[PDB]
Design a protein around this ligand. Structure first.
Ligand SMILES: CCCCCC/C=C\CCCCCCCC(=O)O[C@H](COC(=O)CCCCCCCCCCCCCCC)COP(=O)(O)OCCN
Ligand SMILES: CCCCCC/C=C\CCCCCCCC(=O)O[C@H](COC(=O)CCCCCCCCCCCCCCC)COP(=O)(O)OCCN
Ligand SMILES: CCCCCCCCCCCCCC
Ligand SMILES: CCCCCCCCCCCCCC
Ligand SMILES: CCCCCCCCCCCCCC
Ligand SMILES: CCCCCCCCCCCCCC
Ligand SMILES: CCCCCCCCCCCCCC
Ligand SMILES: CCCCCCCCCCCCCC
Ligand SMILES: CCCCCCCCCCCCCC
Ligand SMILES: CCCCCCCCCCCCCC
Ligand SMILES: CCCCCCCCCCCCCC
Ligand SMILES: CCCCCCCCCCCCCC
Ligand SMILES: CCCCCCCCCCCCCC
Ligand SMILES: CCCCCCCCCCCCCC
Ligand SMILES: CCCCCCCCCCCCCC
Ligand SMILES: CCCCCCCCCCCCCC
Ligand SMILES: CCCCCCCCCCCCCC
Ligand SMILES: CCCCCCCCCCCCCC
Ligand SMILES: CCCCCCCCCCCC
Ligand SMILES: CCCCCCCCCCCC
Ligand SMILES: CCCCCCCCCCCC
Ligand SMILES: CCCCCCCCCCCC
Ligand SMILES: CCCCCCCCCCCC
Ligand SMILES: CCCCCCCCCCCC
Ligand SMILES: CCCCCCCCCCCC
Ligand SMILES: CCCCCCCCCCCC
Ligand SMILES: CCCCCCCCCCCC
Ligand SMILES: CCCCCCCCCCCC
Ligand SMILES: CCCCCCC
Ligand SMILES: CCCCCCC
Ligand SMILES: CCCCCCC
Ligand SMILES: CCCCCCC
Ligand SMILES: CCCCCCC
Ligand SMILES: CCCCCCC
Ligand SMILES: CCCCCCC
Ligand SMILES: CCCCCCC
Ligand SMILES: CCCCCCC
Ligand SMILES: CCCCCCC
Ligand SMILES: CCCCCCC
Ligand SMILES: CCCCCCC
Ligand SMILES: CCCCCCC
Ligand SMILES: CCCCCCC
Lengths: 729, 729
């Protein structure tokens, strides 16, 4: 063969069984376009940054009339099953089919399938699922065979497969995938590109944004994840948000999958997450979109404009530039930095908008060990992305917005840090609320309320201590039975804490009709629970305020005492290092010959004496006077020693600054003794002071105050969207 | 060559420069015995258990008159310097020289160097120090060259080098080693045997006890360690302990090296360990030897009788037989099991005796991070070896002792467990002593004693919490500067605690001459410190009660709060597992040809269709109805999950059972509130109760009581030895 400009570009045909299916579609089975009956293979053996410099090309450039690209759909995966992968492909194909049948459109039409380009980017050739790859092979986009790993002393970086198929999935069952090819199917051009070795996930986005997108030059770049299934017309609704030239990014809403006939609602750990997803798409995202800055939830469905993300925003996302705090830990925020660098771009004005008429369902974990490992990634990233934004809020004023937008963004950057500070102090708030409430009901009614207030404290301190020891030196998959018991214990504590307040409040009412507990039934149940229901009704989805609202309350104590403790003890996921310097000089003959053969035996007396004097000389030049610097750690074992130091300094500052709040309200830590000894000179300790009644009201005023802003923000968004709908109708 | 019975046995000569030195010794430089001018090499390529079964042999068996062995000295090492190795060899050579000049002896004499056989067992061929091996090469016991790694599809297990040298070291300086060969030097038979791959240290003892010792068949087997230097005649004095046939093992005493002209006494961390070594060889070892059961200190100098340790004692030391508590953690006790299985041997009667006229000096750590990592091995082994002995104390009565010895051993097995229980509860004892003493001086004199009692509690709780976080998820070599600060803080706390007691006691005396603090200067300073001095004077080494007694007191709080915390959080030294299943099918050509060459390209349409059909068939047979058992952990990654579970269960039971003692004396943990609420029905909390004065005397009575037994035991041993000396004179 004659390789093309130093590159191995091969062109193979397809199976005979597959071509016959395509032949039935046309009205004359004699000829077919070359794009429908071939599969271009090529090896890259270079970097994604210099893909266009090494005379590399894609299949879209070399046409009689060059094709333009309007949407580039990226779909990353890593050893997912062949059922999770099919769900995303089925959702993608239906949207493309929908966008073809549009009658009146200046962009889309009956020949609009030449714009969308699907791009699957797998990770690792030895880690991809065996069954998932067979699904791609059944679509005509994979052929076993050519896997050249090197070309002229150049290891290949990644393999590129590409083909324009005409088979789209019809129905995904629980154990089967239905494939069909009829007159009502649209062709989908695939660009399956498989990587060689495992390189995390940020490198996968580097192969797309800096790689193929640099050759195709699309308008919009949409990000997906294997498992997420877009809706019937979710692709089209998200594309309509770029009508005005100010938007530089968008995302829809994400929903949980309830199985078949709503069967997955009996699980207390699935119904709990069904209420948390709803309350995040109704109270938080709308309020963030009002100002003009949003952060996409993990697993969601997002799209960026390729003109906005080009240059500085992409330079500080991939590389980001030692061992400095804001440069070495910045990978923990995932892509939340990309959303922040777009709004604050110099001499430009881009805003992020939240679309509501585009949804994407997904599955959720149903076991406890698997559910803890997932939130570990979310919490560590949502905590660092708000500390980075607050310390760099001055960069908004160097942008190109007007005067109103800058002031509106500065307020939101403070309102987010206030929410972060509330969540940082939530470990010492729950204990104080639990302790000032059980004691206060024992000083008023006695009876059996005196022993129950001592059993629950010891049952709390034992479960809290065991979570710190099992998170610093153990895995959550080994000891699975203990976490379930801890969750049940916390749920029971929550039930008792709820009952005590109702009892005290009803007694207070009966003793004044026939105060800390008087306004406790007025602000924590009348102004917090009512606004949630009103906001849900306004959002026109009021069917989750009774379905799965009880289960979320019982698992509330396990969101701040089992999930925050594990997420802070595992920040960087270090691995130290073993290595080893095996003796390179080895394999001295094999003596395979049974006998006779003597090989080479040194008998040279002079050589023997030279060797003996060569070992005798080593003991001479030993003087340690010039003490050389000890062998410093490489670079891979010295960076690990830095991740272990910035992680032990966060656990200490999180425990010490939370115990100070407890030793100012409860007068623990030896402070009450100090007052008593000061009072015995000019001698006893009260059980409860007056500082436990001021604090018990402040921590409940902030809870209902933060639920008041989320209602005004949710209502303004709907009011504006209703007028937009009326005007555009 | 004609290999011997399936074994590669080669015989090389020595360097010409080395033979000339030997030639000067004899009175006729014409001939020399073959043992003095050759070096036998052999590869083992088998197991130590079956060394004699594969027709293997040593150089001592094939003589005109077979030689018998009286002492087999084992010297293990692992990447030690060439100065530490020379110190042991110089000490060994001087003892052999001393044992030759004895005039009247029925065993030793002028030709007694044929009995002692030195055996150096290095570990790892790629880990041995390159400079230390040159010292062996300069002795005529190593030749670079033949290092065959395989023979007829059989990997070599270990390499055997052996030669009878005649050069002994004269003086070891700080940077040089002096070698000489004169008329007053004795030959030493070396058996340097170098291992192939790193296999810990228990395997090294298996190569000796089950290996060479099975062919040489010695009388006594002495154990050493590179770095330990025996005394002038320490070998001979330890051999005299086997005169009577009841002894089945012995050991001497170990001392610290004070450098040159006592220069290493200025270090507070070296002087502290100088007083701990003395108090262990004067109060503990003598008392244990009185009963008849002793445990050798780490790094010491011990000897066993090969007849006593043969069979069951060696079968349960190496193998010891699942995942059971007393079978999987038994490797933590090192060789302390061997000492226990000798005394309780079935139908036999062996006792362990402690010799006092044989010493061996060694170096000690002088940095803090290096000192913490060493005691981590000692504490984890001395705690498990006493729990195993107490739960199996019934095995003494099945032995062959008389009636008195069984009763004497049963008492000692309880007295050791009592000492272990005292040390298990030492975390909550120091805090109680520190807290009941600083508060009590603030309720009597006020002034500045009210603020100092609150600063020290907060300064204690911050240093105690940071030691649990830095030991469960960090290495002690990284954060070196924090441990030094923690030690200084604890030392200052100790000084303040000492001053408070003296102040209170002198006030108590002055207020009765012109009670908890009255007998506090009578039992904790009059009956504890005096008995130490009396025992030291009786031992005839009373020069360490003022030299390094102050430094040991200041570092006393750091022996139970920095060393016990780190030793319990790191019990098994687990490493989890990474592994990885790299794609075995790989290496798809190299395409090295610049052009033209097409190699093999499949174009077979039928084969292509068959391939497409075999990838299409995988999606068919997928039915998950028969849910197979998930892939269980191998055996190496499942055992690690068991070591992590038995280690988190020890840290929890050590913290919970120590906080209960604090919540019964100080009435913390919510218990005082319970009493107050019970008292408000039929309402305040006292600062100090009467249980803090009963406990403060009990914990000081046990301290001076345990120092009273160690004096009687130390005196009885010396009284008996004096009569033995008088009778044997
Ligand atoms: C010997 C200890 C064994 C257990 C170790 C557990 C693990 C980690 C280290 C813990 C360090 C703190 C040990 C406190 C020991 C204790 O039981 O001491 C009590 C409680 O004292 C209080 O206030 C209670 C303080 C609770 C602290 C919880 C953790 C806080 C972390 C940050 C610590 C910062 C400094 C805190 C200093 C106290 C003193 O009671 P009292 O004599 O005043 O009772 C007077 C009644 N009339
Ligand atoms: C929110 C916590 C943040 C810090 C977490 C630190 C790390 C690990 C988990 C610690 C679990 C225990 C938390 C105790 C919280 C606390 O500050 O609570 C106090 C102290 O209470 C006491 O007694 C002091 C108890 C000290 C316990 C030290 C460790 C013991 C380990 C085993 C625990 C076994 C169960 C113990 C139950 C208490 C209640 O003070 P009060 O309202 O009675 O003061 C009345 C004055 N008139
Ligand atoms: C008569 C006053 C004392 C009554 C004590 C009753 C205790 C009942 C405890 C029941 C279990 C509580 C949860 C473990
Ligand atoms: C004088 C009476 C004292 C009674 C103390 C009762 C203490 C009960 C502790 C229960 C702990 C339960 C842990 C699971
Ligand atoms: C199979 C995984 C289940 C996870 C949730 C466990 C239950 C949590 C709530 C318990 C409530 C108990 C009320 C009595
Ligand atoms: C005079 C009425 C006394 C009522 C006492 C009730 C005690 C609490 C009972 C329920 C405890 C929590 C069970 C989960
Ligand atoms: C100095 C850089 C390394 C820090 C390692 C962690 C030190 C933790 C102990 C000190 C905590 C101080 C809290 C006020
Ligand atoms: C070599 C030592 C490196 C220490 C790095 C410490 C970085 C600062 C950590 C601050 C943590 C603050 C948490 C709120
Ligand atoms: C390292 C910082 C330590 C701060 C300690 C603060 C202790 C609490 C002081 C409370 C003062 C007011 C008491 C009523
Ligand atoms: C989550 C809010 C943290 C900061 C405020 C905490 C309370 C401060 C004390 C309030 C009570 C009054 C004490 C004098
Ligand atoms: C006049 C009564 C109060 C006096 C307070 C004096 C405090 C002195 C503290 C000195 C440092 C203590 C160790 C940090
Ligand atoms: C009403 C006056 C209260 C005074 C409280 C003083 C607390 C001092 C705490 C010192 C902590 C030092 C840690 C290193
Ligand atoms: C170089 C390593 C030193 C280790 C010991 C540090 C000092 C311990 C004792 C401090 C005493 C301080 C008295 C004021
Ligand atoms: C009436 C006399 C009062 C004396 C007060 C002494 C206070 C303690 C001083 C030393 C503190 C510890 C220093 C290391
Ligand atoms: C009374 C203390 C109970 C502690 C339970 C939590 C620790 C469990 C560790 C893992 C145990 C695995 C075998 C059951
Ligand atoms: C698979 C779970 C294994 C758990 C093993 C637990 C063994 C017993 C540990 C007891 C520790 C006692 C310390 C005093
Ligand atoms: C798991 C075991 C828990 C035991 C709790 C014991 C608490 C202390 C009881 C003290 C009773 C006497 C008080 C004066
Ligand atoms: C180290 C000894 C541990 C066992 C005994 C601990 C003290 C027991 C209580 C003594 C005081 C009296 C309480 C009623
Ligand atoms: C260079 C590192 C700076 C870290 C700044 C952290 C600020 C945290 C919030 C402080 C105010 C509550
Ligand atoms: C972010 C939440 C912080 C903690 C708020 C209070 C939790 C307990 C509420 C109990 C209601 C009965
Ligand atoms: C969550 C509530 C659990 C207990 C059931 C309600 C108890 C109400 C008591 C009212 C007394 C007047
Ligand atoms: C930032 C750590 C928590 C403490 C915040 C300040 C508390 C001041 C209390 C003053 C009481 C008089
Ligand atoms: C973050 C908001 C903190 C508000 C603290 C208010 C404290 C008020 C003390 C006096 C009440 C009468
Ligand atoms: C099978 C495991 C048995 C462990 C026994 C431990 C005993 C510890 C001492 C109990 C009495 C204080
Ligand atoms: C094994 C030792 C346990 C703790 C004994 C008491 C320690 C503090 C002594 C203070 C003397 C002034
Ligand atoms: C270890 C002692 C440090 C303080 C110096 C001695 C103080 C003695 C005070 C006596 C008062 C009567
Ligand atoms: C074994 C764990 C520590 C507790 C030992 C028993 C204490 C009993 C105290 C009884 C007080 C009335
Ligand atoms: C291990 C020895 C424990 C001894 C406990 C004695 C308790 C005595 C209580 C009554 C004193 C008057
Ligand atoms: C998943 C079946 C119900 C579990 C209930 C746990 C409390
Ligand atoms: C770059 C660090 C800025 C800190 C600001 C704290 C208000
Ligand atoms: C130029 C910086 C202006 C900050 C305004 C904060 C409200
Ligand atoms: C972007 C339209 C003006 C906003 C002004 C906010 C004060
Ligand atoms: C009144 C004391 C009761 C102790 C046992 C409660 C279960
Ligand atoms: C899946 C394991 C369930 C254990 C329940 C313990 C209460
Ligand atoms: C349309 C701008 C609204 C700003 C205030 C949002 C709460
Ligand atoms: C080793 C030189 C003296 C150190 C003293 C540390 C307190
Ligand atoms: C084999 C376990 C014996 C336990 C004895 C406890 C006294
Ligand atoms: C046969 C067991 C006898 C035990 C005696 C203990 C003193
Ligand atoms: C071994 C000599 C007899 C000892 C009896 C101890 C009671
Ligand atoms: C009397 C209060 C003093 C507080 C500061 C002590 C250093
Ligand atoms: C060797 C490092 C010494 C640090 C001293 C800090 C007080
Ligand atoms: C010679 C036996 C002595 C037994 C008692 C030792 C304290």
């Amino acid at each position: 063969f004659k390789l093309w400009n130093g590159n191995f570009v091969f062109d193979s045909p397809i199976s005979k069984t597959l071509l016959d299916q395509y032949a039935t579609t046309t009205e004359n089975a004699n000829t077919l376009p070359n794009e429908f009956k071939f599969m271009r293979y090529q090896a890259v053996t270079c970097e994604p940054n210099q893909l266009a410099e090494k005379n590399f090309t894609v299949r879209q450039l070399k046409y009689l009339t060059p094709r333009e690209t309007e949407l580039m759909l990226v779909v990353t995966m890593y050893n997912e099953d062949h059922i999770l992968l099919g769900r995303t492909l089925k959702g993608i194909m239906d949207n493309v089919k929908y966008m073809v049948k549009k009658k009146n459109s200046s962009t889309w039409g009956p020949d609009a399938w030449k714009k969308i380009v699907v791009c699957i980017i797998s990770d690792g050739r030895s880690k991809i699922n065996e069954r998932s790859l067979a699904l791609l092979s059944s679509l005509g986009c994979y052929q076993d065979g050519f896997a050249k790993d090197e070309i002229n002393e150049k290891k290949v970086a990644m393999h590129v497969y590409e083909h324009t198929t005409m088979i789209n999935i019809t129905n995904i069952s629980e154990s089967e995938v239905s494939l069909e090819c009829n007159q009502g199917t649209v062709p989908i051009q695939l660009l399956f590109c498989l990587k060689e070795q495992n390189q995390k996930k940020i490198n996968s986005h580097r192969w797309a944004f800096e790689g193929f997108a640099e050759l195709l030059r699309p308008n919009i770049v949409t990000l997906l994840d294997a498992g997420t299934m877009p809706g019937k017309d979710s692709i089209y609704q998200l594309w309509r948000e770029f009508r005005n030239p100010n938007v530089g990014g968008a995302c829809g809403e994400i929903r949980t999958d309830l199985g078949k006939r709503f069967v997955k609602l009996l699980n207390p750990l699935v119904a709990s997450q069904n209420f948390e997803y709803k309350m995040s798409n109704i109270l938080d995202k709308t309020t963030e979109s009002n100002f003009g800055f949003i952060t996409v939830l993990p697993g969601a469905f997002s799209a960026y404009r390729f003109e906005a993300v080009r240059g500085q925003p992409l330079q500080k996302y991939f590389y980001g530039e030692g061992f400095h705090f804001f440069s070495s830990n910045m990978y923990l925020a995932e892509d939340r930095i990309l959303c922040f660098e777009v709004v604050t771009k110099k001499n430009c004005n881009w805003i992020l908008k939240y679309c509501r008429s585009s949804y994407a369902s997904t599955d959720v974990p149903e076991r406890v060990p698997e559910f803890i490992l997932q939130r570990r990634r979310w919490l560590n990233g949502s905590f660092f992305a708000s500390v980075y934004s607050f310390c760099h809020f001055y960069r908004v004023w160097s942008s190109g917005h007007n005067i109103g937008r800058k002031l509106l963004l500065t307020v939101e950057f403070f309102y987010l840090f206030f929410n972060t500070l509330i969540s940082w102090f939530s470990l010492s708030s729950f204990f104080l609320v639990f302790r000032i409430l059980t004691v206060s009901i024992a000083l008023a009614y006695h009876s059996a309320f005196n022993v129950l207030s001592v059993i629950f404290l010891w049952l709390y301190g034992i479960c809290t201590l065991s979570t710190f020891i099992l998170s610093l030196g153990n895995k959550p998959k080994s000891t699975e039975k203990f976490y379930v018991l801890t969750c049940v214990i916390f749920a029971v504590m929550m039930i008792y804490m709820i009952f005590c307040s109702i009892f005290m409040s009803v007694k207070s009412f009966q003793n004044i009709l026939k105060t800390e507990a008087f306004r406790d039934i007025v602000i924590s149940l009348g102004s917090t629970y009512c606004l949630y229901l009103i906001s849900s009704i306004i959002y026109l989805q009021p069917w989750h305020m009774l379905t799965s609202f009880i289960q979320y309350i019982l698992l509330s104590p396990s969101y701040i005492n089992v999930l925050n403790i594990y997420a802070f003890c595992n920040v960087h996921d270090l691995s130290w290092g073993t290595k080893g310097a095996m003796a390179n000089p080895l394999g001295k003959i094999n003596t395979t010959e049974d006998g006779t053969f003597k090989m080479e035996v040194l008998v040279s007396s002079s050589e023997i004496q030279a060797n003996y004097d060569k070992y005798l000389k080593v003991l001479n030049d030993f003087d340690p006077k010039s003490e050389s610097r000890p062998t410093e750690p490489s670079y891979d074992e010295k960076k690990t020693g830095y991740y272990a130091n910035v992680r032990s300094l966060v656990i200490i500052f999180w425990v010490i600054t939370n115990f100070i709040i407890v030793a100012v309200v409860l007068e623990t830590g030896g402070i009450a003794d100090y007052i008593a000894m000061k009072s015995i000179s000019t001698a006893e300790i009260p059980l409860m002071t007056s500082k436990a009644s001021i604090y018990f009201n402040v921590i409940l005023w902030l809870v209902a105050l933060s639920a008041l802003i989320r209602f005004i923000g949710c209502s303004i968004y709907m009011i504006v969207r209703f007028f937009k709908k009326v005007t555009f109708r």
